[PDB]
Symmetry: C2
């Protein structure tokens, strides 16, 4: 009928085979689907028809005359009977395979119409009127004489397989020279760089296709060296080219890496089946370059970027390498349906939050909902290790979602009177889905000050660990309480408390055996772009400081996110070291209500408007991969709607409804004798020995100094079964060489803690007490935060933090302002933390003088904190004992001495410790013990602290019976009743003065000057002030000035 002729061509299929492997490897790992050789051959024909429109024509007799007809389109016929893919000439690869699979998913489903069989112009068959040519495709074969040759002879010799293409053409309208060029052009296309560049583009494959190049003539040994160079480059910096960004904002990311490029390493497609020696665990092993490269891609350049070759410990690097480079089994369909059920719950909660309430756009997890399945994997993996509890600290973003879907709190409890709910703590229990374990989950309170909670969490976890006898101060080394700390990308990079907290990771006094860090990196900080937020590649680069492994993961891949979360928990359990997970995601909405984020970030938000949610993309991925059926997916949408329904239904229902501190002589003597009950063969430093000896003397003979009075209070608490945690900068010895809580053996360096002996009763039995004394790192913010957190974690522990000088505590202002002074009023979170602040005007300058009493007195409100400035060692002793034993959890701020530690007048009698209590107001001993007349007094000086001793000395020298000195030991809360009882004893006073060392604008005057004549107007109306002049600094810089100012105060007081 059609006089036909044939033209045959043997085409190399090596690039075709190789790129199909890359394409289907990708699809398998991503959204699913399988590209056939027919897809590639069919599309090539359609492109070759563009260079040769005559191969598309067909013979006809139109008006008795032989004619060649130019059809309107390229309608490629395919043997399925031949069905037509219409209008192929205006199709991109993606459109063509969609059209190809449309006809195919209808031949199988029996939904093909007569229209699908008409109008074919060219066709393809896989072993004629109205069509000019039929292209035939043979099976992939080796050239004759190479059939039966070893798979390694084929590899060594560089022999590839061949497709024989045939072209049966109408010789009335097509020339044999043209037909041959058509096949030569399909040959060229199926070896062409740009051809495979488009196929990859159109399938979303970010990797460079396998390239048709000439086989490198170098030896296997020389190439092997380059393979090993390439393995090291992926391991070290493969993370720089990983497909971690769900938005793919930076196109350039997947190129211009000569270090990871196979082609710039003298390797070609011809080496893919060649075997190369690679060193590892089982020693040297021979592997196919193809396998080497696919493992490297899967491990370092897909949805997970691994940073680990910065870790100085080789064992840890091998550990990560082994787990990340092994062929790890795909999750079970039950495991995938579980991850999807979590995404359903996360997305339903988010949808509800933004629908049912206004002003919730700032807490939106929309674009970051994978954090919920990720956090679930973390907590489940901790339960798998049989751990006790997971304590979470996080900012406001997604917090109520974490309460519902992670802490497991009911909607009735979360939304009762729906804000402060984004700052309060919670406790729940997590039950394993597949496993048989349960774990406690708790969330800690936090302010709006980003990252400020980081050290608080650590302190709180450490207190729980110590109680559970786990970790550092525990019999086991499990650290069965896990810190899970969330962060945002901008705050993690810019806030210093992060480096300060990371620095505590492995310290004896602060370690919690590793923290799991999750950074919700939405690549934005309110209005700010990452280039204005950090001077480094990743927001997590600060974690490299402690050599922590960093995992950058694609927030659109909840399988990779869960896998990484579990790996993180396993590393932490293995090395007791912090792990950071950088979850790359996006913020779908504006920062707050009304905000149009395209005002400042138009590019990012044009891209975000084209993004479908994690849940819909994950469901589609599962379908396309053949992991779930359409029915299984319909059930998933049914589950999402059910979740969305019960959250609306549950909140709808709720809206329809809604004191003796004295000790015995035996106790004093026991604490004193402990200082000499040295271990066998212990060599005390010759300068330390007189101190131990003076302490035994003091405990028996009196004249107790401040430093010993402190150890007497702490020692007696330990003896009574209390945990005592003391720490600060150089706190083991004391800044002023006064504590000696820990004494070092002069010859061996062995440490001895005398107060630890009090943890054992005289009969040998433990008391239950403990003395935990540490030298802190050189930080104020993290240390103060840690101790605050510790008291919250263990309310029965006596927790003390000591400033080197009270002048440096301003470095912890966020903690004081946001947690210590206000946590009870704001969150109902109680703390019994003690801040020891060395204070006193001694002529050492503006940074060695003041603890800023005036600032604490300003933060104070009825029952928030206790503020005291004791003038005697025994009053300090009773203050600490009262604090530890009152059953009240309220912070105590103490203004402690420096030179008054060695003042021989500031000493206490044994009866002051055994027959007294804390005195909030103190009188001169001459009126309470001696033979002094209070009626002779006409001038009353009210003071606090060390200046009492100078005013007392002056009164004694001049012998002034008309002047009395009254001390306010407890500055806040004011001892109104005790102060009134005292002043009533001086009936002939004609003038009262508040006397202080500090500038007029500092100390207690700004407070007392205003409140004392208000609180007690019958006693203090007309109260005058004697102080230093108001200053913009805590003191003068000159010692000589200080001395003149100090004498001015005493002269005025007695003038």
């Amino acid at each position: 009928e059609v006089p036909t002729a044939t033209s045959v061509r043997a085409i190399p299929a090596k690039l075709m085979i190789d790129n199909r492997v890359v394409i289907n490897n990708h699809l398998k790992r991503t959204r699913g689907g399988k590209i056939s050789f027919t897809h590639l051959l069919g599309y090539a024909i359609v492109q070759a028809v563009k260079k040769f429109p005559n191969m598309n024509r067909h013979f006809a007799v139109v008006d008795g005359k032989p004619t060649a007809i130019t059809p309107a389109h390229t309608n490629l016929g395919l043997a399925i009977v031949v069905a037509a893919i219409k209008r192929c000439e205006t199709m991109r690869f993606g459109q063509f395979i969609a059209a190809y699979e449309d006809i195919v998913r209808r031949a199988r489903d029996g939904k093909l119409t007569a229209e699908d069989f008409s109008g074919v112009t060219i066709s393809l068959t896989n072993p004629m009127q109205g069509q000019g040519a039929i292209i035939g495709a043979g099976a992939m074969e080796y050239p004759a004489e190479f059939q039966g040759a070893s798979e390694e002879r084929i590899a060594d010799l560089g022999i590839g397989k061949l497709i024989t293409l045939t072209s049966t053409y109408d010789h009335r309208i097509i020339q044999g020279a043209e037909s041959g060029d058509f096949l030569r052009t399909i040959h060229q296309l199926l070896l062409d760089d740009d051809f495979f560049d488009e196929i990859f583009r159109e399938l979303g494959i970010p990797y460079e296709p396998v390239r048709w190049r000439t086989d490198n003539p170098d030896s296997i040994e020389d190439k092997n060296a380059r393979v090993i160079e390439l393995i090291a480059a992926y391991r070290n910096r493969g993370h720089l080219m990983a497909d971690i960004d769900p938005l793919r904002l930076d196109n350039t990311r997947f190129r211009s890496h000569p270090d990871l490029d196979v082609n710039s390493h003298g390797l070609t497609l011809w080496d893919l089946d060649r075997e190369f020696k690679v060193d590892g665990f089982a020693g040297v092993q021979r592997k196919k370059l193809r396998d080497i490269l696919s493992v490297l891609r899967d491990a370092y350049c897909r949805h997970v970027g691994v940073e680990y070759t910065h870790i100085l410990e080789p064992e840890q690097q091998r550990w990560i390498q082994e787990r990340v480079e092994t062929k790890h089994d795909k999750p079970t369909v039950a495991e995938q349906k579980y991850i999807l059920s979590k995404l359903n719950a996360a997305e339903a909660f988010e949808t509800f939050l933004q629908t049912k309430y206004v002003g919730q756009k700032r807490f939106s997890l929309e674009g970051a909902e994978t954090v919920i399945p990720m956090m679930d994997a973390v907590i489940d993996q901790c339960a798998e290790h049989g751990l006790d509890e997971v304590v979470i600290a996080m900012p406001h973003r997604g917090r109520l979602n974490v309460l519902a879907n992670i802490v497991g709190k009911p909607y009735s409890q979360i939304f009762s009177e729906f804000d402060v709910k984004y700052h309060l703590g919670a406790t729940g229990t997590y039950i394993q889905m597949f496993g048989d374990n349960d774990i406690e989950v708790s969330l800690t309170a936090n302010p709006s000050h980003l990252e400020a909670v980081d050290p608080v969490l650590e302190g709180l976890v450490r207190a729980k660990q110590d109680l559970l006898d786990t970790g550092e101060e525990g019999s086991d080394n499990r650290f069965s309480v896990v810190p899970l700390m969330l962060h945002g990308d901008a705050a993690f990079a810019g806030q210093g408390v992060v480096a300060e907290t990371l620095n505590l990771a492995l310290l004896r006094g602060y370690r919690t055996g590793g923290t799991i860090h999750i950074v919700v990196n939405n690549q934005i900080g309110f209005t700010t772009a990452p280039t204005d937020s950090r001077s480094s590649e990743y927001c997590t680069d600060v974690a490299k400081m402690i050599g922590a492994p960093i995992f950058h993961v694609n927030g659109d891949d909840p399988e990779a996110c869960a896998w990484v979360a579990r790996l993180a928990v396993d590393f932490r359990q293995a090395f007791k070291k912090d792990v950071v997970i950088d979850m790359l995601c996006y913020r779908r909405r504006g920062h707050n209500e009304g905000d149009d984020p395209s005002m400042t970030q138009p590019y990012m938000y044009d891209v975000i408007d084209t993004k479908r949610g994690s849940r819909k993309a994950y469901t589609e991925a599962l379908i396309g991969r053949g992991d779930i059926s359409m029915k299984e997916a319909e059930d998933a949408l049914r589950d999402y709607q059910g979740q969305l329904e019960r959250v609306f239904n549950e909140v709808r229902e709720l809206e329809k409804h809604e004191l003796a501190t004295a000790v015995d002589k035996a106790m004093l003597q026991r604490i004193g004798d402990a200082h000499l009950a040295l271990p066998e063969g212990f060599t005390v430093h010759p300068r330390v020995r007189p101190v131990l000896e003076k302490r035994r003397e003091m405990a028996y003979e009196g004249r107790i100094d401040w430093a010993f009075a402190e150890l007497l209070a702490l020692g007696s608490l330990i003896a009574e079964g209390k945990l005592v945690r003391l720490s600060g900068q150089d706190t083991q010895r004391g800044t002023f060489t006064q504590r000696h809580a820990v004494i070092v053996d002069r010859k061996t360096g062995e440490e001895f803690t005398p107060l630890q002996l009090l943890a054992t009763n005289p009969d040998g039995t433990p008391t239950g007490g403990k003395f935990l004394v540490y030298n802190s790192a050189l930080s104020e913010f993290a240390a103060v935060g840690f101790e605050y957190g510790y008291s919250v974690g263990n309310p029965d522990a006596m927790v003390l933090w000591e400033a080197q000088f009270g002048d440096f505590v301003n470095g912890a202002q966020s903690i004081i302002d946001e947690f210590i002074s206000s946590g009870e009023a704001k969150w109902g979170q109680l703390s019994d933390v003690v801040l020891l602040l060395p204070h006193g005007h001694e002529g050492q300058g503006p940074d060695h003088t003041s603890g800023r009493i005036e600032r604490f007195l300003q933060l104070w409100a009825e029952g928030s904190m206790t503020i005291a400035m004791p003038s005697t060692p025994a009053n300090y002793f009773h203050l600490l004992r009262r604090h530890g034993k009152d059953g009240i959890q309220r912070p105590l701020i103490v203004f402690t001495p420096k030179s008054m530690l060695r003042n021989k007048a500031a000493v206490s009698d044994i009866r002051d410790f055994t027959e007294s209590k804390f005195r909030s107001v103190l009188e001169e001993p001459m009126y309470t013990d001696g033979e002094g007349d209070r009626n002779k007094v006409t001038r009353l000086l009210l003071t606090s602290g060390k200046i009492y001793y100078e005013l007392a000395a002056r009164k004694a020298k001049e012998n002034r019976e008309d002047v009395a000195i009254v001390r306010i030991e407890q500055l806040a809360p004011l001892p109104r009743r005790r102060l009134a009882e005292t002043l009533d004893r001086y009936p002939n006073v004609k003038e009262k003065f508040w006397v202080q060392e500090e500038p007029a604008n500092q100390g207690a005057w700004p407070s007392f000057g205003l409140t004392l004549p208000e609180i007690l107007p019958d006693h203090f109306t007309g109260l005058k002030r004697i102080s230093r002049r108001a200053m913009s600094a805590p003191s003068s810089g000159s010692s000589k000035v200080h001395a003149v100012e100090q004498q001015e105060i005493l002269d005025t007081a007695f003038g």
Copy 2:
């Protein structure tokens, strides 16, 4: 006769002499090794002189005795006693060691033949056994102070060259990545285990032996893959990564930077010239003499001794010299107190007369540095700082950035030289523990904060007062935080001043090449206690037993120069003579002792908002704002946001530099500023106020608008801006809080620098802190800038504290600030919802015919027809609450109530206030009205000071506020609303 393999002998001698040439000096002969082996009792040495009592000699003593006999044969001073008393002798004969490339591969070594019956043949066998013995070469090395493991006599690995080459390449990577973990960087050598601990760096655990040393291996590089001898490979690796310099660089993500370091560190360095060594030693002499003087002539000056860290002086000298070599303009130094006066004398170059005439450890200085060998000059300056360690780090950065911008260098300059260099010193404990370090390091490459690289020197004395490094950091080095910005780290032996100078110059070269920070960890020690009376052996007895055996850097360096044969004994005597002279002159020198603008200006700033670049696409929500601004500039009703840009714009137009920055400051936290507008289609930025930097005639005004979005930090950002105003006193510098509630994260900068720098150091700053403040029901962290705290820090003329209630009063406040010729910080409590209040708007005449009013009256009494005589109750207030009290007064129509605003809280406008109150003669009660709790806002201050400062007006002043609270406000909006109505009701009750 006996033929012996002397391969281990040759190999270890190469290692021995390679070590000695670099360190202490001297050359070990084969005769030293053979002679000592024989001994293992007087050994005769051939003309045959004896070494007596060899049996009680260690290797070092034997070589000393051996060379003591050589210095008697050469010097002709041998006595008869030196020839009488011998036991055994050596000349025992000794034969010479006999293709050069074909022999290396077969594993054949050189043979040495020995001579002299059975016990004689056994003695040559005991000699044989010793030259291939571990413990022998182990003790020889320990005696010569060599910290490395000797070459071992092991059996040749039977594996192929290709297989070994792979293990060689693994080993090269191991040294490059982790070799620093094995470097001789500790002058005290406290950790013995250091040179054994690593199988990763061990040649023997890599299937390589001494038999592979002369075997060639293929190694890739810059000029391509080249064949090198394993011994050459290993010696280069050791010299580069395991001697006195530990290099950390493989963590750097930029390859061109890693190659750069690799090339400079792995090339064969030429030894310094004797002039260069005598110069380094002259600097150590000056440093040690100054220290000796300081501890002799003064007591209490032990707190800041550099004793054990004096190499920091030659190191810092190399840094500054290298900056002068690059022809840079200035080096600005920030450092703690340790060694500060030494830096003043020997680095800043201040005379002893100026230094010694304490506060001196906190004040700034300026000097000029002149090159020794070079022909250049460079300015050297030191900045003021508190005792708060590391807090100056951001201040230095801000101060360098201000100087760079003035010099038209770097980021806001025509050149990319960054000709002003930050040189920041630190201590090991503070660098690791203080967060402001990470916050400052984070600014390194930001557009708004970059200074083109900071040189960091960490004076690492391996102690932090009484605290040991294990209690101070959770990482290997105190410098590990620098890895955050991918900065190269160099760990250097403080006892080797040549390596310290070399590293300093390399650091300056890297910084100039990549405009990125470089950290030098100088390992040293603290010879004395932390301060005075301190016996450091109470807490660190081990470290201090070791330190008591250490001879100083100067004696150590002079002895090494002698040993190496770099200087003669006379040249060393001159060096002690120089030290003595330096010590003498230091003792001898000290012994001798209108804001209004015109309509044209307003209109120009307004028109600028629409003078868009050609083809610019404004966001549709931004366009109405630009249009309203042109309208406001011509028609009035000027809002707060525009009033601010009117003040800044007019300053730029008058030739002033204006630097504005904070979190999301380009747009504004409340979408109100729009200082920078982003092109909807291209992302291109447009800054309308920059147009004002050019006069109508086209000429530049000299002004500039530098507006930035800060990083998410308060401490570093506030510090940076404080520093900026100090570096450029003629610049208008503003820092904006997101909410005034977050500025407490910058408390150290407020307390130590801003509020007190003038009183303490004489250091003036004109910095402006913008703190969004107000009770609006948003919670305790979105309400207060803590007015009460600033008012407490204030003392006559330290700062200005204001809370303006109108856009024009804010405008005049900023203009007064920028134009008063006074350098004093300004704290402004700015609005949030009052930005959009239609009543809080200003008229054009308020900008053109007025000035800043510190005290404001109700417009009805100053413009309207209101009677002040009708008033019996006076309400004193400040800020937004005025509008609610005014609305309430208007509603109820209350002529008997007057509202007076205190716009300037500090310093109190005593005269303006009295003048005003005197106009209300029938007032029967005065109240201070505030939104804040009783213990906060201005009441704690005003309640005490107003009845003191003006007793005839304010005795009897009562308060109307919220109750005292432990937080700035309630957490509930509903509570806030009830409390807010309570205030208004009480005020009008």
